[PDB]
Design a protein around this ligand. Structure first.
Ligand SMILES: [Cl-]
Ligand SMILES: [Cl-]
Ligand SMILES: [Cl-]
Ligand SMILES: [Cl-]
Ligand SMILES: [Cl-]
Ligand SMILES: [Cl-]
Ligand SMILES: [Cl-]
Ligand SMILES: [Cl-]
Ligand code: NA
Length: 129
């Protein structure tokens, strides 16, 4: 599923992500934009052999099981395939664990490089929320 910008903002809000760990909704929408272009089915292999999954490109090295990332963990206790669903519940619940891990949203390198410090409210501007 390819979400619309305001559609995803509303789904993220419904699943409790707005201001989660102090990160406003626009931060989450901005991160999803540059991780996946709002496509729940996005996958991207990493040089280390892990794979990133879903709207927030959650990595198999630590967070989900895909059966092919040697020495990895599954700290969200989910198959990585669950992160590709049209229903964003699994991605949101796992992102809550990731953003609580110590470095906030810097865990998402693209958030640090393309969202951090910018006018992230632009990503929810005009949306009925
Ligand atoms: Cl957009
Ligand atoms: Cl917010
Ligand atoms: Cl915002
Ligand atoms: Cl594995
Ligand atoms: Cl584990
Ligand atoms: Cl599994
Ligand atoms: Cl959803
Ligand atoms: Cl923080
Ligand atoms: Na894993």
């Amino acid at each position: 599923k390819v979400f619309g910008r305001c559609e995803l903002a509303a789904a993220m809000k419904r699943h409790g992500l707005d201001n989660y760990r102090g990160y406003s909704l626009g931060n989450w929408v901005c991160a999803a934009k540059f991780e996946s272009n709002f496509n729940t089915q996005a996958t991207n292999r990493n040089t280390d052999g892990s794979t990133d999954y879903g709207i927030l490109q959650i990595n198999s090295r630590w967070w989900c099981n895909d059966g092919r990332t040697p020495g990895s963990r599954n700290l969200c206790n989910i198959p990585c395939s669950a992160l590709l669903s049209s229903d964003i519940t699994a991605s949101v619940n796992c992102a809550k664990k990731i953003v609580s891990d110590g470095n906030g949203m810097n865990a998402w390198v693209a958030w640090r490089n393309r969202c951090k410090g910018t006018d992230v409210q632009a990503w929810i501007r005009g949306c009925r929320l």
